[PDB]
Structures are given as structure tokens and as C-alpha cells.
Amino acid sequence: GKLPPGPSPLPVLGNLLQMDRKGLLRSFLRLREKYGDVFTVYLGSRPVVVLCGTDAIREALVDQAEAFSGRGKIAVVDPIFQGYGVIFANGERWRALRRFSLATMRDFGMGKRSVEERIQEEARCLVEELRKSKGALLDNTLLFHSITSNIICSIVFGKRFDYKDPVFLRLLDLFFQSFSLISSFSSQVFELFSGFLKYFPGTHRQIYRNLQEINTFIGQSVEKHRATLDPSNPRDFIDVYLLRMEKDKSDPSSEFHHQNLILTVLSLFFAGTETTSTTLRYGFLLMLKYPHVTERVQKEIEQVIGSHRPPALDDRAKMPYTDAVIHEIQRLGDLIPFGVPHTVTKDTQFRGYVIPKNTEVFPVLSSALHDPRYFETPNTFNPGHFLDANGALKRNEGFMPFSLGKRICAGEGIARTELFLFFTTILQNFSIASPVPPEDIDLTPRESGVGNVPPSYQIRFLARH
Numbered sequence: 001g002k003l004p005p006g007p008s009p010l011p012v013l014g015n016l017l018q019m020d021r022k023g024l025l026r027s028f029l030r031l032r033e034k035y036g037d038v039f040t041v042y043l044g045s046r047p048v049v050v051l052c053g054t055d056a057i058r059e060a061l062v063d064q065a066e067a068f069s070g071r072g073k074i075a076v077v078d079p080i081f082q083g084y085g086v087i088f089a090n091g092e093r094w095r096a097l098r099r100f101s102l103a104t105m106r107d108f109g110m111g112k113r114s115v116e117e118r119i120q121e122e123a124r125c126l127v128e129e130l131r132k133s134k135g136a137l138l139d140n141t142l143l144f145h146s147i148t149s150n151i152i153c154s155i156v157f158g159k160r161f162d163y164k165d166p167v168f169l170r171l172l173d174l175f176f177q178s179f180s181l182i183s184s185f186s187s188q189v190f191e192l193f194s195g196f197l198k199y200f201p202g203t204h205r206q207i208y209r210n211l212q213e214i215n216t217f218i219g220q221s222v223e224k225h226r227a228t229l230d231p232s233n234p235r236d237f238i239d240v241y242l243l244r245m246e247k248d249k250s251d252p253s254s255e256f257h258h259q260n261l262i263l264t265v266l267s268l269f270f271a272g273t274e275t276t277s278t279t280l281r282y283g284f285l286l287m288l289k290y291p292h293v294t295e296r297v298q299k300e301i302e303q304v305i306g307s308h309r310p311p312a313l314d315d316r317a318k319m320p321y322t323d324a325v326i327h328e329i330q331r332l333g334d335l336i337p338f339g340v341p342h343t344v345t346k347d348t349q350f351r352g353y354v355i356p357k358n359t360e361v362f363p364v365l366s367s368a369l370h371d372p373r374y375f376e377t378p379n380t381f382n383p384g385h386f387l388d389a390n391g392a393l394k395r396n397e398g399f400m401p402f403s404l405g406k407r408i409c410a411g412e413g414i415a416r417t418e419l420f421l422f423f424t425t426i427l428q429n430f431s432i433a434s435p436v437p438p439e440d441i442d443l444t445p446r447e448s449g450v451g452n453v454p455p456s457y458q459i460r461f462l463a464r465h
């Protein structure tokens with residue numbers, strides 16, 4: 001047997017001395033150098049096996065997919081999920097929820113209109129809101145979170161909120177804080193010493209409280225559904241879950257009960273709102289930095305879509321340049337740097353090692369997004385990475401923003417459609433500008449952790465003629 005190489009741990013402190021003040025990612029990337037693509041670091045008591053670069057990650061996640069299909073924990077939010085919900089679930093509970101969760105998001109939303117149709121309609125709402133600002137300088141963070149939320153909201157509660165609704169803004173508010181603290185330095189620390197730190201104060205409490213307030217809201221909404229519920233006509237994700245919960249009333253092994261509903265719906269909000277939203281937010285910071293790319297995108301929007309009909313999803317196969325820019329926004333923006341923790345579902349033999357069942361594995365998505373074996377000049381923005389000589393989109397093995405394998409993002413289809421429809425629909429109707437000149441713009445994340453949080457910035461949206 002034997003675990004993969006690593007620094008010798010110090011019990012109760014692990015490799016805390018072999019870490020890097022920057023954060024967990026720099027700690028992983030630095031150790032990588034000494035010990036290779038696969039290694040074993042200790043986050044307090046916890047032995048974790050880190051994976052690096054397209055090849056390693058792919059061999060594990062794809063090659064031994066079931067073996068690596070387990071879910072670890074995130075110290076700062078486990079107190080909330082405790083293994084419930086379509087993300088943090090495991091074994092048979094997980095397979096049951098994911099299967100349900102895929103099919104269900106696919107066909108139910110407010111209006112029995114398609115996922116694409118809702119995103120199109122949100123985009124239409126977004127455009128109109130932006131006209132109201134008459135091209136004045138704003139911070140798009142709030143709006144950008146608003147439009148992502150409303151997609152999940154339409155899907156899960158079967159209704160969108162008006163951008164200015166106080167229920168909603170309050171919700172977005174709680175949301176807005178938690179997601180950024182999840183990636184704060186403290187929460188990275190809390191990752192190694194939750195045993196200790198779980199006791200004194202810290203941000204894990206405001207994270208914990210805030211998330212609980214959201215859960216309270218999902219609580220209320222469930223009850224309102226539960227009562228108005230009509231079996232003939234499920235309205236959305238929540239009704240579909242109830243109707244299943246009833247089909248299962250006599251099944252003691254069914255995983256479709258209250259906790260999985262709450263924590264699932266929470267997960268579809270946490271995942272759906274936050275990553276897509278900061279991706280868009282980061283994409284537009286790049287468009288301020290590369291007005292030339294922005295302009296080429298707007299021109300393709302012109303040749304293919306035109307200035308009158310709203311962008312539709314299948315316009316994308318006709319628009320490889322724009323498609324490439326979105327790939328290149330995801331790749332560089334690298335919103336989830338060390339993936340979400342996995343575990344092996346069994347003793348596993350891997351690259352001549354043995355990894356014991358249930359050991360947390362960290363597939364470091366970033367080291368594949370910036371893997372030189374697959375991307376020339378990995379730290380610079382170039383839509384070129386995804387274009388061939390003819391300007392056709394060009395698949396690249398190293399690009400796995402949603403991770404790979406059996407746990408690959410359950411929302412990747414929705415997220416990709418959001419990116420494409422929001423990007424094209426804003427640029428169709430608007431030009432962007434910043435006070436800051438391009439050369440001055442600094443893409444350095446304000447916070448780096450389980451997620452990447454891009455810096456805030458001023459931007460104006462100028463209505464097009």
C-alpha cells in the first residue's frame with residue numbers, strides 16, 4: 001500500500017508548517033513542486049490527497065469514476081448540510097437525489113416554459129432594468145446576482161422576483177455575505193482546525209446564521225407549496241418533490257423527505273446563484289480590459305443574430321468566437337480553484353499508491369485550467385485557446401471548469417446557457433465602459449478560496465443605436 005508522498009505531519013497540526021500564508025490553493029500548488037502531481041497533506045487531523053494537472057485529475061475522476069465519486073466536506077458549511085442535499089449527499093442518497101434533480105430541473109419551472117425560455121425572459125428583464133440606469137456608472141454585482149437567482153427561483157419556487165423587491169433584496173443580501181465569507185481567509189483556516197476553532201467566534205457563525213435564515217425562507221415556501229399543491233399540475237421543482245414524496249409514502253428507504261428538500265433547494269441556490277454570477281461579473285471585467293475582444297463579439301452577434309431578435313441558445317453553434325470567449329472567461333476566471341472535495345468510495349490503487357476508503361481527495365481544477373501541457377501561456381487571456389485555424393471552436397482536454405466524472409456539475413447545462421444568453425443579450429443591446437483604462441485593470445481576485453471572488457468595479461452600460 002502507502003499514501004502518496006507528502007511532508008511529514010505533526011499530529012494535531014499536520015502540515016500546517018508546510019502551508020502558505022496565501023491560502024489553501026497556493027499551499028497545494030507550492031507543495032506540488034516538491035512532491036509531484038499527486039500528494040498527501042494534512043489539514044489538522046485530516047489526511048487529504050491532492051490531484052494536479054489535466055492528466056492526474058482525468059485519470060482519477062474519469063478513469064476510476066465510481067471509485068472517486070464520493071463527496072468530502074467543507075468545514076464552514078458542513079454544520080449546515082451534514083450530508084444532506086444533492087451536493088453533499090453520498091452513496092445511495094446522492095444517486096437518488098442527483099437522478100431526480102437532473103430530470104426535474106430539465107422540465108419544470110414557472111410557466112412550463114423551458115429553461116432556455118426563462119433565461120431568455122430574465123435577459124429581457126435585465127436589459128430593461130439597465131436601460132433605466134440611462135448609462136450611468138454602476139456596480140453590476142447586485143444585478144448580476146439578481147439575474148442568476150431568478151433562474152433558480154423560477155425553477156425552484158416557480159416565480160421570479162422583481163429586481164427591487166425587498167423580500168428578494170434581503171434574500172440576495174444574506175446570500176451576498178455568506179458566499180464571500182466561505183472563501184475568506186478565516187474559512188480557509190477553519191478548514192484545518194474546525195475541531196478547535198468551531199468553539200470561539202469567527203465568521204463561521206455569520207455564515208452559519210445567514211445560511212439558516214435562507215433555509216427558513218425555503219421552509220416557508222415549502223409550506224405554501226404543500227398547501228396550494230395540485231397533483232394534476234406541479235408548478236415547479238418543489239411540487240415535483242412533494243408529488244414524489246407522496247408516491248413514496250410507503251417506502252422506508254426513500255430519500256425524499258424534508259431535510260433533503262430543504263438542503264437540496266438550498267444547494268440549487270448556493271450553486272446556481274454564486275458561481276454563474278461571479279463568472280459573468282468576471283467576464284465583464286475582461287471585456288473592459290480587452291475592448292478589442294468585446295468588439296469582435298458584438299460583431300459576431302451582429303452577423304449571426306442581428307440587432308432585433310433576442311439571442312437564442314442554438315445561435316451559439318453559429319458563433320464560435322463568442323463561444324471561445326466564454327470558454328476563455330471560464331478557464332482564466334477559474335471560479336472554483338480546488339474543486340469541491342471528493343472521497344474515494346473504497347480502498348483504491350492509484351498510480352502505484354493505495355488510497356483508503358473515505359479519504360478526502362482534492363481535484364485541483366485550477367492546475368488543469370492553467371496546465372501548460374494544454375494551454376500555451378496559461379495566465380494570459382486568449383480566446384485563441386479554443387479556436388482552430390478556421391475560427392471553429394476547438395475542444396481542449398484541459399478545460400474542465402465544472403470538474404469531470406460522475407459528480408460533474410449537475411447544473412452545467414443551465415450555467416452554460418446562462419453565460420451565453422446573458423453575455424450575448426447584454427452586448428447585443430449595450431456597449432460597456434469603465435473610467436479605468438484597460439491597461440490598469442487588475443484581474444486579481446479579491447478573495448481566493450473554495451471559490452474565487454473577483455474585485456468590485458465600476459462599469460457603465462451604454463444603450464446601442
Ligand code: HEM
Nearest residue numbers: 087271272275276336339340401402403407409410411415
Ligand atoms: C456557472 C459556472 C458553474 C461552475 C463553474 C460550476 C462548477 C461546479 C464544480 C467545480 C462542481 C464540483 C464537481 C465535483 O468536483 O464533484 C460543481 C458541482 C455541482 N454544481 Fe456547479 N457550477 C456552476 C454553476 C452551477 C449551477 C447554475 C447549478 C445548478 C443550477 C450547479 C449545480 C451543481 C450541483 C447540484 C453540484 C453537485 C453535483 C454532485 O455532487 O453530484 N452549478 N459545480
Ligand SMILES: Clc1ccc(-c2cnc[nH]2)cc1
Nearest residue numbers: 074270271272275340409450
Ligand atoms: Cl462548497 C461549494 C460547493 C459547490 C459550489 C458550486 C457548485 N456549482 C456551482 N457552485 C460552490 C461551493
